[PDB]
Design a protein around this ligand. Sequence first.
Ligand SMILES: [Mg+2]
Ligand SMILES: [Mg+2]
Ligand SMILES: [Mg+2]
Ligand SMILES: [Mg+2]
Ligand SMILES: [Mg+2]
Ligand SMILES: [Mg+2]
Ligand SMILES: [Mg+2]
Ligand SMILES: [Mg+2]
Ligand SMILES: [Mg+2]
Ligand SMILES: [Mg+2]
Ligand SMILES: [Mg+2]
Ligand SMILES: [Mg+2]
Ligand SMILES: [Mg+2]
Ligand SMILES: [Mg+2]
Ligand SMILES: [Mg+2]
Ligand SMILES: [Mg+2]
Ligand SMILES: [Mg+2]
Ligand SMILES: [Mg+2]
Ligand SMILES: [Mg+2]
Ligand SMILES: [Mg+2]
Ligand SMILES: [Mg+2]
Ligand SMILES: [Mg+2]
Ligand SMILES: [Mg+2]
Ligand SMILES: [Mg+2]
Ligand SMILES: [Mg+2]
Ligand SMILES: [Mg+2]
Ligand SMILES: [Mg+2]
Ligand SMILES: [Mg+2]
Ligand SMILES: [Mg+2]
Ligand SMILES: [Mg+2]
Ligand SMILES: [Mg+2]
Ligand SMILES: [Mg+2]
Ligand SMILES: [Mg+2]
Ligand SMILES: [Mg+2]
Ligand SMILES: [Mg+2]
Ligand SMILES: [Mg+2]
Ligand SMILES: [Mg+2]
Ligand SMILES: [Mg+2]
Ligand SMILES: [Mg+2]
Ligand SMILES: [Mg+2]
Ligand SMILES: [Mg+2]
Ligand SMILES: [Mg+2]
Ligand SMILES: [Mg+2]
Ligand SMILES: [Mg+2]
Ligand SMILES: [Zn+2]
Lengths: 119, 43, 89, 121
Amino acid sequence: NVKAYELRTLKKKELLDKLDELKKELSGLRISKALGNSAKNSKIHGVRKNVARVLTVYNQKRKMELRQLYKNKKFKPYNLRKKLTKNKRLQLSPKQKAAMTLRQKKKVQNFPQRKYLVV
Amino acid sequence: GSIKRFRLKQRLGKCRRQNRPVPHWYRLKNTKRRHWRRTKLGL
Amino acid sequence: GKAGKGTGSFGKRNGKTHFLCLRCGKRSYHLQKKKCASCGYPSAKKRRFNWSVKAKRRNTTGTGRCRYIKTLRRKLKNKFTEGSTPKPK
Amino acid sequence: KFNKQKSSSRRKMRKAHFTAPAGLRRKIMSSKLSKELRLKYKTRSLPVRKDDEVLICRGHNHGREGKVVKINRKRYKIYVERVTREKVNGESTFIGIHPSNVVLTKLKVDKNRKKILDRKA
RNA sequence: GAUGUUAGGAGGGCAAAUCCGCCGAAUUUAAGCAUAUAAUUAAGCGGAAGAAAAGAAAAUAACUAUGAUUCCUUUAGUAACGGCGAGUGAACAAGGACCAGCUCAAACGGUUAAUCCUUCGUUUGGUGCAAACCUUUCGACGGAAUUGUCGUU
RNA sequence: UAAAGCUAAAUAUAUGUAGGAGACCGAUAGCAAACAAGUACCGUGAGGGAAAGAUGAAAUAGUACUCAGGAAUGAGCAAU
RNA sequence: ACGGACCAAGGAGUCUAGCAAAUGUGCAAGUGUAUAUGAUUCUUUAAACAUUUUACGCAUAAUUAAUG
RNA sequence: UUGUGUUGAAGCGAAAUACGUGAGUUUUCGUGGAACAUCUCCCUAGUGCAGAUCUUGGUGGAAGUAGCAACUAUUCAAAUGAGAACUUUGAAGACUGAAGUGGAGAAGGGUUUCUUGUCAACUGUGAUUGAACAAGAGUUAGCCGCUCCUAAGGGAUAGCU
RNA sequence: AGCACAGUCUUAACGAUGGAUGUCUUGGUUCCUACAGCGAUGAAGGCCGCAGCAAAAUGCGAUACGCAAUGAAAAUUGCAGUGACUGAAUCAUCAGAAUGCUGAAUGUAAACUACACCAAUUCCCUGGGAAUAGUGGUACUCCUACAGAAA
Ligand SMILES: [Mg+2]
Ligand SMILES: [Mg+2]
Ligand SMILES: [Mg+2]
Ligand SMILES: [Mg+2]
Ligand SMILES: [Mg+2]
Ligand SMILES: [Mg+2]
Ligand SMILES: [Mg+2]
Ligand SMILES: [Mg+2]
Ligand SMILES: [Mg+2]
Ligand SMILES: [Mg+2]
Ligand SMILES: [Mg+2]
Ligand SMILES: [Mg+2]
Ligand SMILES: [Mg+2]
Ligand SMILES: [Mg+2]
Ligand SMILES: [Mg+2]
Ligand SMILES: [Mg+2]
Ligand SMILES: [Mg+2]
Ligand SMILES: [Mg+2]
Ligand SMILES: [Mg+2]
Ligand SMILES: [Mg+2]
Ligand SMILES: [Mg+2]
Ligand SMILES: [Mg+2]
Ligand SMILES: [Mg+2]
Ligand SMILES: [Mg+2]
Ligand SMILES: [Mg+2]
Ligand SMILES: [Mg+2]
Ligand SMILES: [Mg+2]
Ligand SMILES: [Mg+2]
Ligand SMILES: [Mg+2]
Ligand SMILES: [Mg+2]
Ligand SMILES: [Mg+2]
Ligand SMILES: [Mg+2]
Ligand SMILES: [Mg+2]
Ligand SMILES: [Mg+2]
Ligand SMILES: [Mg+2]
Ligand SMILES: [Mg+2]
Ligand SMILES: [Mg+2]
Ligand SMILES: [Mg+2]
Ligand SMILES: [Mg+2]
Ligand SMILES: [Mg+2]
Ligand SMILES: [Mg+2]
Ligand SMILES: [Mg+2]
Ligand SMILES: [Mg+2]
Ligand SMILES: [Mg+2]
Ligand SMILES: [Zn+2]
């Protein structure tokens, strides 16, 4: 029934091995079901779940490795890029939006909107 | 007839599957049946 | 004419004008014409008309699960940065 | 009432009650604790668990104490040791009691319960 | 100028209540009908956003003058239009909501394009458990650009 | 001071999602749809488009048992 | 002459705009606080309250195509 | 506003030495099983039905009536079964009469095929039958097709509108 | 053991038929407030799947009525089985992972699971050792940059 916290520590090969075993077990169960049996029909669900868990663990490991590989370097795969609503991606970064023509900037610096308490 | 496209065959199969009645055990915790002669799939 | 306008002529009704329509699944793909009556299938465009309000309602964005759109809803509310989990323990 | 984020609206409330998730259900199957228990812990009332020992107050069995057998969050009903009842068949089932109508005496107490008590304090 | 599965990017479709462009009827009213009316509406086609559009005067006034746009109250069912029939019909001022101004081009700077971008980098920081982000200034190697970038007003 | 350009606010919203309200409707009403409803079903097709809520406090009380019946059912001195 | 086999439920002068008359009510050469503001206004409150420490409407004057 | 309700509300049914000219009101008994009035005043409206070839749903008389008459035609015995004119088997008698209710395919249908069950409805008489219902099963290709070619034609590329 | 003629019509009582009335109400409607886009990073829409016993809807996507993580937190139950004594059974949350075939659909096609061509691709172990015909890519228009040819 193997829960994830055990599996994080395992190396990828070991994980793969585990997964194959689980798959084999599942296949066996399926075969049994197909044949006139209902002894361990309900065992299958758990096995399936276990398999799923294993897959998840492995997938996340793989993703982490990928991320490590493509750390920085301007361009990246579009997977490892910031998946985010298209419009937002298109949109100008806040900094870009801010960026002021030099005269305007100067003006801002000189005559900023002051605080002035009226009495 | 006796020469279908794969898609059509699959659809037919789906329809057949849909046809079958409520599994009786559920009733312890159907109106969309279709008889092949009276109501057509209209494919 | 035995194959006259009514019942006799309904005997000669075999052979579909429309089949199933890749895209809409609505048995309204005119085979001979190669064009769906409720889509405009080959036209990259959905063929909907403001004169058909019922039609519009029976195929809008809400009608059918929204595999991705639904998932993205709530994200604004959350405003979580992408890639980020919660703290463990 | 005074905060207008919550709804008074009867319908809405009823929907919430009936269609509540499991956590909500658990929360709203609470029971009054006896005087002794109240004195012991600042708590007035607790969500009832399996091995608690309740005294029934209302219903046909206004007095029969017993260990809670099962709590059933679908129907909002606890069942109690000996509140037995034959069906038409003869099969001896437990009679359901809603936790309004019960007051819990002896307390099932795991770490979670302890934590809850501490929080209440 | 073609050409490239060259390197990097963009568009396409869905959705529409409000919104912006076109395109564009007729029923209807006139006790008929033809101009009118319906209506610069419906439908059609296209395009945006959380709002859109408008907007910083080639404006109004004729005053002791006001001062971008928008919206509300009004002006006003008024001026006006109209087989002067049916019917249609604003604007300025006034009272408010809200109030925000600006930069190109042209002028000027050649004791030198000061600009700008792509790729490759380099090394201080900040929050994060990580993931990512956030900024920091520093060069190269490319190009772009004198058929004009940047500063000055 | 036309023939180049930008610009927040007050404004609108019968679409969607989420809230909240009502001198609103109460199952022939109210959305077409309180229910596996844009579902079933009809139409080649564009499209058209329903009906259908309520046992009881509790079925973890949904009809045990006996008799008559081929069975459905019926009856009970039997039963929730 | 037409409609009505029967029964149940549904089923038809309504709502807005602007004008008028009638009548009630307030105030009365005035009247209406319009938008909007303000409040120690905030379940009800989308009401109620208030009107800044010469707005506008209709009326108070008519008449003329008109300068008047 | 000031009240009635599980010592039984609304509703409904039948009434009543009842009241009202009348719309109605009121009360009794029964059923019913939870709400209900306000006439103290006035507020509000999707406010009152016999008609609309009204709408919707239901139910009648017609009426156990019309009718269940194309395709020449059935009969005997036995079986199965609660039950057999129309299920099965046998024996007769018949018909289709290779332009066939015969064999194969196309379109269309879509599992109707098949076995085992089986009868609530349906199979306009019956029914143990069934194309109904339920449970399972069943479609095997290098050569049969599609897949390739081009046809009448279609959709596009360039432009051009 | 007897006696009512029968039918038609009427009234009352007690039933059938039907679903009115009344009572409800996880629904609608209206108004108010608030935010407000999804998509070549493959959208909406459509198909096909996915449960031990599973039709619909609901949920989900070959990790398929769910995985991870977080916050609850002892059950779930029709049976089978799985769990507790807290990453576990179940809920909510949902940011990680994943997301079949399509569809703008985009390699050519389309009543095809038809067909090209270019990369062979993928995994494991710290440069080898394993797999699988599997996996990607190739649309049109456009922009910047580069390329070597054209006048
Ligand atoms: Mg076919
Ligand atoms: Mg037929
Ligand atoms: Mg044709
Ligand atoms: Mg577009
Ligand atoms: Mg006319
Ligand atoms: Mg006329
Ligand atoms: Mg005419
Ligand atoms: Mg339009
Ligand atoms: Mg703008
Ligand atoms: Mg105005
Ligand atoms: Mg006026
Ligand atoms: Mg006009
Ligand atoms: Mg200008
Ligand atoms: Mg502009
Ligand atoms: Mg309805
Ligand atoms: Mg006549
Ligand atoms: Mg007449
Ligand atoms: Mg008649
Ligand atoms: Mg009639
Ligand atoms: Mg008056
Ligand atoms: Mg009453
Ligand atoms: Mg009416
Ligand atoms: Mg009526
Ligand atoms: Mg009537
Ligand atoms: Mg009448
Ligand atoms: Mg009728
Ligand atoms: Mg009749
Ligand atoms: Mg027969
Ligand atoms: Mg013969
Ligand atoms: Mg003959
Ligand atoms: Mg058969
Ligand atoms: Mg029959
Ligand atoms: Mg059979
Ligand atoms: Mg069948
Ligand atoms: Mg061959
Ligand atoms: Mg060819
Ligand atoms: Mg040709
Ligand atoms: Mg063409
Ligand atoms: Mg008699
Ligand atoms: Mg947008
Ligand atoms: Mg989990
Ligand atoms: Mg946890
Ligand atoms: Mg393609
Ligand atoms: Mg073909
Ligand atoms: Zn289509």
